[PDB]
Amino acid sequence: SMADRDGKIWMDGKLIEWRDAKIHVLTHTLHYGMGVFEGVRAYKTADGGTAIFRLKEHTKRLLNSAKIFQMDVPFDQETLEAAQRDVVRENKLESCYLRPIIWIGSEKLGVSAKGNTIHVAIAAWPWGAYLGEEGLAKGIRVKTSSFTRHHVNVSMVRAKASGWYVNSILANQEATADGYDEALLLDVDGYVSEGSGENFFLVNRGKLYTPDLASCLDGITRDTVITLAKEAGIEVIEKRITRDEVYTADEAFFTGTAAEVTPIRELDNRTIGGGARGPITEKLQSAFFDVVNGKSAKHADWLTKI
Amino acid sequence: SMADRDGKIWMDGKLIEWRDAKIHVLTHTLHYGMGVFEGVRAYKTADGGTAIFRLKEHTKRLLNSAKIFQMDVPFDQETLEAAQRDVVRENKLESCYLRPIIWIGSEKLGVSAKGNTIHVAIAAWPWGAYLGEEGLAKGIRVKTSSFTRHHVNVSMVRAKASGWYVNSILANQEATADGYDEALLLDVDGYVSEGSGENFFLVNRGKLYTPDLASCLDGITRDTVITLAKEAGIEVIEKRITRDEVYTADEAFFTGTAAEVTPIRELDNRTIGGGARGPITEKLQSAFFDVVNGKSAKHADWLTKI
Amino acid sequence: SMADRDGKIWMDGKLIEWRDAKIHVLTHTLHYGMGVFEGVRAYKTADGGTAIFRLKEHTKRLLNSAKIFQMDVPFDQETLEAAQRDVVRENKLESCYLRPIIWIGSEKLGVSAKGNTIHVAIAAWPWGAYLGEEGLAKGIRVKTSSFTRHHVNVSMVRAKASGWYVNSILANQEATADGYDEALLLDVDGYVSEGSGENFFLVNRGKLYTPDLASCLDGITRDTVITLAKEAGIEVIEKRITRDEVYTADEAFFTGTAAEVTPIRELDNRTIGGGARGPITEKLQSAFFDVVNGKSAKHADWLTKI
Amino acid sequence: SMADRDGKIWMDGKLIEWRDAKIHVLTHTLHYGMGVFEGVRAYKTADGGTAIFRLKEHTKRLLNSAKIFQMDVPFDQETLEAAQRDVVRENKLESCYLRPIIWIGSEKLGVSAKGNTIHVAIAAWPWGAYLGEEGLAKGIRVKTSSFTRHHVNVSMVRAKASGWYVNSILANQEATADGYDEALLLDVDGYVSEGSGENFFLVNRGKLYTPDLASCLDGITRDTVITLAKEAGIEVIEKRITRDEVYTADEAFFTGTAAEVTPIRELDNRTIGGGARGPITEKLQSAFFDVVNGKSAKHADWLTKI
Amino acid sequence: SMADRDGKIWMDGKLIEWRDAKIHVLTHTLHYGMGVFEGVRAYKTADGGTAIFRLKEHTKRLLNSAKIFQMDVPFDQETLEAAQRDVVRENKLESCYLRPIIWIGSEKLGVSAKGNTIHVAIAAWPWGAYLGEEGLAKGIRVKTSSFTRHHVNVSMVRAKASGWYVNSILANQEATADGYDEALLLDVDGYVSEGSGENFFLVNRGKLYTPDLASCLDGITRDTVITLAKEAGIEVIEKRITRDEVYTADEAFFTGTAAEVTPIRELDNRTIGGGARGPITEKLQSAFFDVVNGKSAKHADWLTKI
Amino acid sequence: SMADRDGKIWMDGKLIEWRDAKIHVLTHTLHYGMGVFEGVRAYKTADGGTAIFRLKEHTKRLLNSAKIFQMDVPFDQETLEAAQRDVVRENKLESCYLRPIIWIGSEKLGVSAKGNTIHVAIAAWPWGAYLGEEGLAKGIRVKTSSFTRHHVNVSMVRAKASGWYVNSILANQEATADGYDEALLLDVDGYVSEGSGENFFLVNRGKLYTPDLASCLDGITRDTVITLAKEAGIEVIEKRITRDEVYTADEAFFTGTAAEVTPIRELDNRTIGGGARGPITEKLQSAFFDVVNGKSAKHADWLTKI
């Protein structure tokens, strides 16, 4: 149980006991879905310390998400960054996942959010076993969802919002119920957008391709991989991608804070390339894990020591 | 405050004290938006009694919403109907708004959503006219939103789901920030769909028009008004409606449990007809209120005495 | 040259000599397309008199077109109805086409549209069969346009507006350039909408079909024919029509004030039915001309004597 | 009044008196919207002279607009360039605005433009005070319109045509009626296209972004700014932009002949960046005004001395 | 094998031995997909005889399919009807499936189809329940496909054309590969259109619902069922249907010549109603089989004895 | 006749006599459209020899097309490449058009392709310029089709599939029936996609434009021309292109195996630039024919000697 645990949660300005982090059922966000959250990793680094990965960019996006919804957050970025470090430190955590969430309180329950408190909470918990290059060598099997990805003037897709993930859950459940590892979603035009919670990449003829920044979230892992790709001399192309363009690709993979860099060996029971992790995916995977493990000089400023 | 009140809330099989109806901040629905709810009204009827309006139909829709999401609800329809009546009775309410809500608990916080408790809670409180008393009698000013209504293969629009209402909030806030009473949303094709929390009707040449049951919710108030219109010998036509078709209509109005029957006297600063409450609207509105107040011989079974 | 004529034109409150009806080249509507107009016919009736067909309905739509654009017209409906009768009378026309137009003057030439005079002019001239006397009896050859019909949230399709007809010109010119009589336009979804300046009907298995009132103008001739069809015991169905649904139709025809009721005997070089004017088209065509010629007692109220 | 002035207007081959530039009300373009126009600025340059900005490019676009409509213009580019200079010179103008317009005459008033004279007129009038960098230091407040931008197979959006601006007026009136400075329009897919009469740019992470050349007009100010940006070493990216991508941008601005380079400090009541003019926008403003004032070494060929 | 068997096939005017009905690999339709076919059943009637169900309507549609493609068929409807009867007779079949097919021959292999032979062949064989015999009585499990149903201005969906069924194969293969019985396809807007080879119906609150005749084939079984429904006093409604509208329907079923009337007990692992063949479905299914077996006098003219 | 010829056809593993390459009319692909094919040319090279142009890429794409449809091809790429060379050699062809085709056999004729034999055949014949020799030199006249290009989630557009060409035939017939040389198709959004059997390019201000790889085939000739353009120092830009963007372009041309590099001098009766073959088109066309004729050392590896 996530609720019944010893530990500390940061809530509305103070560290409180984990179990005391509670709200009433007539909370606006529970009923109407307007809330925003982040997903952030901390890694044990090669020198023995713990560092949060791209803390600044994640916290900037968190506040930008609230700003999209015109949610006045009673804390600045500097405060929230320190608070996230606090949560990791006081829970005696090393390799872990941080979940900041900002939501709308229980003062009034009309559609209008006007007059409700804007709450902020930050919790963290241990990550599972470290996978790395060795643990993420076998690709996963993906299914194209029959549910369509968010429309960009119905949902604000640059916001990492609570309400958006009903779509993700429906897509993810469709895939796993028929034995697949994850879903891949097409946008309203039938072009590949992203996974249920991950951005999508393919490789063809030594070049890295990814859907243009249209209906998908502006992933921080996505941005990380694109930067590492260019730095390694690999050309990156953003374009509209069809599903059969994926079927015929040399390699493919997912990126996300939780997913890191995860190879896709199969889509809709079409084997991707040779069916193993491809060489470009491997290269980017190693560049990625070198960065998050603090074995990279070029990107030291992406790690925040606890 | 909705949290800080005296009274009883029905939750997971029993009446608890109002303030005790709490959840952890790591509740699945708070983060990922998959929950379902209903809006139901109890009315003080002409005989001095209290009666819930179309309880069965609302409870049926609540379980169907959960069914669409494959959420297993640990209570059947008969139990939930009785629970709603219990809430109204034990809180000694003469008239109220009921809010049943079904959500996903705090046992685990992945998108993968497996193994979480399916919670159910029912609260009720006194709540006046959603769009105001002056609105009911004189009509309101409405603004066509620049936010687009839900796409039917992205959101499951037949389910009244928590996550869906980010879109309603964005639209409603856009309208009210510029001084309008409510928003009207167009679907992805540019046709009138509905209000942020209301089904939409217009009147033209003595006939009642409403958008076909496409991108909009299958409103129970909507269904009520259509039945009353047919019983009054008024022809009802379901079609695709353009915004300038509304600009030139004889009358227009909103329907919903909270909004009841609210006239629209103006859309996008274009006066609707004569600019007041039109004769067919007033006719349907009065017929509606005669039903909920228990003054009609034809629809007694739409009312459940407490 | 329709500028160089003898006669009277009603302009801004009074009858003036035809040639004096002039405007400056820095007229707002000339540059920015926002103006509204009507097409109205006066017929020689069987009693030797002249009557305008559905004057009230056309003048109502004209003012509603202005209302859609929030153009404040300096004259009421009674005044404009009389003025149109005045124009027919003072030009000694036994039968004619009336062109009322409302436009935005030359006081200021920004998009700001603020403070310009709202002008109104009415001219009239003899005008025979828009698509030919032969076309009326034998039917015409139509080409589906490669230009798409107006989107209903880009253009306000219920307004008969100046700026809309660029689309009609492009479609019409495409058809006639390759030797066809008229163009047929599909909407943004690829369903049949209407002709470049006519509503569309088809007949199949003794029933009359027409596109639903979606992206097409609410034609008065369209309404006229629908009514006459119902009165003739013919079932009328409004639906989304595909182009190959027309190819395989028993009959098809156009309606409009200029086009009256014009049979379509061929679409995209597919012969419609037998290839001439079909029986149900002929019955509806004859019912139509009986009405405008004042041989029909049931619809005398549709005719206004000069 | 634009009509009642002393001056000279070039019309159909020669300078005539301003007030004599008249046409009949039965002019085809007044009724049907197919006409094309340009907006061109002349600036007082640093050496005391007066020069038209990108006259050749504007006149090329004027003739291309007519060519798109298959309007045979009875004058070549060289003649029209000389006439525009003639109009500035003979009206004794310095800083001013030129308005060339090509339209369809009054020989026949069917939807068919066949047989009608193709007219050309050029007028010009003084500009208000020079704003420059200092005068355009305040960003404006923009509202996303509830009206959708032109469909590229319904309207020919590369043509600057009379009929297109009904949509612009509707969007602009919607914004200004609620107290905003200008409208921003989304295309039929919900992506930012442009302002009602201006192209749109945003800045993020030191890079310049703009909607790809899809549903928007190929603005000459847009082209000017893109070129200056590249010459200043600024990366220019063309992509599909969402409205919340604007909400979260560092800077944004409009470009247009009249608007020059105008910063945007707010969209839909979301503050853009810090709410002031950004450093990139200022740099591009400076480069732009250095060019139009004739103080640029690289782009003298963009100015035509009167 | 379908090729290797004893019997007779009608091909291009004459009955030939089954195995002799061959064509060259360089056959136009084989490479370019433009061919048309039909599915027709003969049943063993209750009097011992054999009758083809709705031969006239199927043969009319066959020629209309050809007409849509402008394929000149060298045989009239009378001849093809007789040919089909001969095929059933000369193969001594008491009950069977007829497959007429019209295709473009091997004279030329450019895209430009001109100058090729238009071939016609008619074969027949005994064929059981298309979706299984157990499915007819107990209902089948259906999966919403991730492939989108034909666009009505890309494909001519009223023609039963060879090339259209790549889409059907892709959807059907997707469903069967994961253990479902058949696929359900949504149109380009996300609404339920039809199965991969079946029209679709749902039942709710005593009424019969089916997608409007938009992107789906004008099914003859669909038409049969609608007629029988109306004759049974069951109200029939054509509308746009969402997938979650199916999830919450009382009943659902497929119709087609091969599939006859097939109940749907489950869609996307959501149980439909009580999870069995519903009462209305049962009533319409029995009405259907009574008609095709010649046990109903009302529709004798739908049967053609061999 | 394509059937009645002397020579050898490679079919299912061996060369057979041309006329013996036969299939049964009850072949799955003939009825349901799922098959894939290629177009490949052998050129008489400058040394008097004969070479297939980019045999590897075409054969790679052939198998990728099969892979998209999950068609298990009983031969590998090495075998198919050698077979194509065999067909040219044994037929004693100096230059020719090669047509490899993979289709689904005649074991079963249900929608389900499981489990029919996957057949492969390869024929070759002399074939001149697809769009004419004069067309290659002076450019052709093109008409924009009123038929819309394939939707990327209805058809798998990266597969060169038999079923896809009903659309091409319909577009191409529409163009030629009215005296044009070829059709140009817009995608479902109104943007230019490609010819009926050709990729599309335009030239503007020294730069080369082509629609992005979205709804069109990933043509190999397209790829070749892009590569040659970059080697010649010409910038290549991929973007969304409107039809009026073509109207106003400096040059335009088609590419394809059959069509080679064919200039377009006219679209929709708008002259493209000078009305003749433009300089950039001539340079690229010349560079192309240099490569396929074996006159260029840079791309010898694209040629496979028979």
How far apart, in whole angstroms, are the C-alpha atoms of residue E258 and residue C18? 70
Provide, as residue numbers in chain C, all residues whose Cβ is less than 8 Å from the Cβ of D181: none
In chain E, the residue whose alpha carbon lies closest to the alpha carbon of F24 is: E22
Pick from A181, A189, A204: nearest CA to A254: A181
What 3-state class would DSSP assign to B146? Answer: coil
B165 touches chain A (CB under 8 A): yes
Tokens, residue F209: 């434009």
> Is B111–A150 a contact, with Cβ atoms under 8 angstroms apart?
no
Pick from E39, E23, E21: nearest CA to E217: E39
Distances in Å between the alpha carbon of A289 and those of A46, A124, A128, B300? 11, 21, 16, 68
Provide, as residue numbers in chain F, all residues whose Cβ is less than 8 Å from the Cβ of D157: 242, 244
> Is C270–E159 a contact, with Cβ atoms under 8 angstroms apart?
no
How far apart, in whole angstroms, are the C-alpha atoms of residue E263 and residue E240? 20
> Is E67–C189 a contact, with Cβ atoms under 8 angstroms apart?
no
Q: How close is the nearest chain B Cα to the Cα of A103, in Å?
A: 8
| In chain F, beta strands by DSSP E | 8-11, 14-17, 22-24, 35-37, 40-44, 50-53, 96-104, 118-125, 140-144, 182-186, 192-195, 199-204, 207-211, 236-239, 251-256, 260-267, 270-271, 303-305
Tokens, residue F194: 């490609």
Show me where chain D is broken: residue before each gap, C-N > 2.5 A.
Answer: none
Tokens, residue A113: 């959010």
E190 touches chain A (CB under 8 A): yes
> Is D112–C165 a contact, with Cβ atoms under 8 angstroms apart?
no
Which class would CATH give A6-132?
alpha beta
Q: How close is the nearest chain E Cα to the Cα of B71, in Å?
A: 11
Q: Is C160 a catalytic residue?
A: yes
How many residues in chain D?
A: 306
Query: Which D positions 100-119 lie with beta carbon below 8 A of chain C?
Result: 101, 103, 106-114
Query: Which F positions 222-261 lie with beta carbon below 8 A of chain C?
Result: none
> Catalytic pick from F22, F56, F60, F160?
F160
Going by the DSSP 8-state scheme, the letter that residue F180 receives in this structure is -
Tokens, residue F37: 């094919």
**What topology does CATH give the domain E133-295?**
D-amino Acid Aminotransferase; Chain A, domain 2 (3.20.10)
Nearest residue, CB atoms, C190 vs list E152, E158, E213:
E152
How far apart, in whole angstroms, are the C-alpha atoms of residue E216 and residue B212? 19
Going by the DSSP 8-state scheme, the letter that residue D148 receives in this structure is P
> Is E146–A148 a contact, with Cβ atoms under 8 angstroms apart?
no
Q: Which residues of B245-278 are buried (b: 16+ CB within 10 A; e: fewer)?
A: bbbbbbbbbbbbbbbbbbbbbbbbeeebbeebbb
By DSSP bridging, strand E140-144 and strand E260-267 are parallel
In chain D, the residue whose alpha carbon lies closest to the alpha carbon of F248 is: D64
What 3-state class would DSSP assign to C91? Answer: coil
Q: How close is the nearest chain D Cα to the Cα of A214, in Å?
A: 6
Within 10 angstroms of residue A1's Cβ, the number of other Cβ atoms is 13
In chain F, the residue whose alpha carbon lies closest to the alpha carbon of A271 is: F67
Nearest residue, CB atoms, F25 vs list E22, E70, E151:
E22
By DSSP bridging, strand D118-126 and strand D140-144 are unpaired
Look up tokens 């066959």; give the residue.
Answer: E62
What 3-state class would DSSP assign to C28? Answer: helix
- To 5 degrees, how large is the angle CA C272–CA C273–CA C279? 110
Pick from D183, F169, D265, C67: nearest CA to B244: C67
Which residues belong to CATH 3.30.470.10 in chain E? 6-132
What 3-state class would DSSP assign to F289? Answer: helix
Look up tokens 């010009």; give the residue.
Answer: D124
Provide, as residue numbers in chain F, all residues whose Cβ is less than 8 Å from the Cβ of D214: 191, 239-240, 242
D185 touches chain A (CB under 8 A): no
A144 touches chain E (CB under 8 A): yes
Q: How close is the nearest chain A Cα to the Cα of E145, in Å?
A: 6
How far apart, in whole angstroms, are the C-alpha atoms of residue A255 and residue A206? 19
In chain B, the residue whose alpha carbon lies closest to the alpha carbon of A258 is: B110
3-state secondary structure chain A: CCCCCCCEEEECCEEEEHHHCEEECCCHHHHHCCCEECCEEEEECCCCCEEEECHHHHHHHHHHHHHHCCCCCCCCHHHHHHHHHHHHHHCCCCCEEEEEEEEECCCCCCCCCCCCCEEEEEEEEECCCCCHHHHCCCCEEEEECCCCCCCCCCCCCCCCEHHHHHHHHHHHHHHHHCCCCEEEEECCCCCEEEECCCEEEEEECCEEEEECCCCCCCCHHHHHHHHHHHHCCCCEEEECCCHHHHHCCCEEEEEECCCEEEEEEEECCEECCCCCCCHHHHHHHHHHHHHHCCCCCCCHHHEEEC
Provide, as residue numbers in chain B, all residues whose Cβ is less than 8 Å from the Cβ of C64: 247-248
Contacting subunits of A (3+ beta carbon pairs below 8 A): B, D, E, F
Q: Are C191 and C202 in contact (CB under 8 A)?
A: no
Q: What's the distance, CA B125 to chain centroid? A: 15
Q: What are phi and psi of C112, to 5 degrees?
A: -60, -20
Q: Are D136 and D261 in contact (CB under 8 A)?
A: yes
What 3-state class would DSSP assign to D63? Answer: helix
E132 touches chain F (CB under 8 A): no
**Interface contacts (B, D; CB < 8 Å):** 20
Provide, as residue numbers in chain C, all residues whose Cβ is less than 8 Å from the Cβ of D176: 112
Q: What is the set of active-site residues of A?
A: 160
Provide, as residue numbers in chain F, all residues whose Cβ is less than 8 Å from the Cβ of E130: 110
How far apart, in whole angstroms, are the C-alpha atoms of residue D82 and residue D63? 14
Provide, as residue numbers in chain A, all residues whose Cβ is less than 8 Å from the Cβ of D191: 152-153, 214
Tokens, residue D82: 């000389």
Provide, as residue numbers in chain E, all residues whose Cβ is less than 8 Å from the Cβ of F198: none
Q: Are F188 and F177 in contact (CB under 8 A)?
A: no
- To 5 degrees, how large is the angle CA A39–CA A45–CA A51? 40
Q: How close is the nearest chain E Cα to the Cα of B2, in Å?
A: 32
**Sign of the torsion angle spanned by Cα atoms E169, E174, E176, E180:** negative
> Is E242–B151 a contact, with Cβ atoms under 8 angstroms apart?
no
B171 touches chain A (CB under 8 A): no
In chain A, the residue whose alpha carbon lies closest to the alpha carbon of B114 is: A173
The amino acid that residue E291 corresponds to is: V
Which residues belong to CATH 3.20.10.10 in chain D? 133-295
Distances in Å between the alpha carbon of E91 and those of A223, A283, E48? 68, 65, 17
- D in contact with B (at least 3 C-beta pairs within 8 A): yes
Which residues are CB-contacts of E85 (< 8 A; sequence separation ≥ 6)?
Answer: E52, E55, E304, E306
> Catalytic pick from C160, C207, C295, C298?
C160
> Catalytic pick from E60, E160, E295, E298?
E160
> Is B178–D174 a contact, with Cβ atoms under 8 angstroms apart?
no
* Alpha carbon distance, N-terminus to C-terminus of chain A: 26
Q: What are phi and psi of A150, to 5 degrees?
A: -35, 135
Pick from C303, C296, C300: nearest CA to C58: C303
Contacting subunits of E (3+ beta carbon pairs below 8 A): A, B, C, F
Pick from E74, E12, E37, E77: nearest CA to E304: E77
Within 10 angstroms of residue D176's Cβ, the number of other Cβ atoms is 17
C148 touches chain F (CB under 8 A): yes
How far apart, in whole angstroms, are the C-alpha atoms of residue C266 and residue B136? 54
> Is D32–C166 a contact, with Cβ atoms under 8 angstroms apart?
yes
> Is D240–A153 a contact, with Cβ atoms under 8 angstroms apart?
no
Contacting subunits of D (3+ beta carbon pairs below 8 A): A, B, C, F
B144 touches chain D (CB under 8 A): yes
How many residues in chain E?
A: 306
Distances in Å between the alpha carbon of A221 and those of A26, A95, A126, A197, A264? 35, 17, 20, 12, 16
What 3-state class would DSSP assign to C285? Answer: helix
- To 5 degrees, how large is the angle CA C264–CA C269–CA C272? 40
Q: How was this structure determined?
A: X-ray
R_g of chain A, CA atoms, integer Å? 20
Query: Would you state the torsion angle of the CA atoms of residues D151, D152, D154, D156, taken in this order, to the nearest 10 degrees?
Result: 130
Q: Which residues of B49-62 are buried (b: 16+ CB within 10 A; e: fewer)?
A: ebbbbbbeebbbbb
Resolution (A): 2.0
Q: What's the distance, CA C31 to chain centroid? A: 24
- To 5 degrees, how large is the angle CA E284–CA E290–CA E292? 105
The amino acid that residue E86 corresponds to is: D
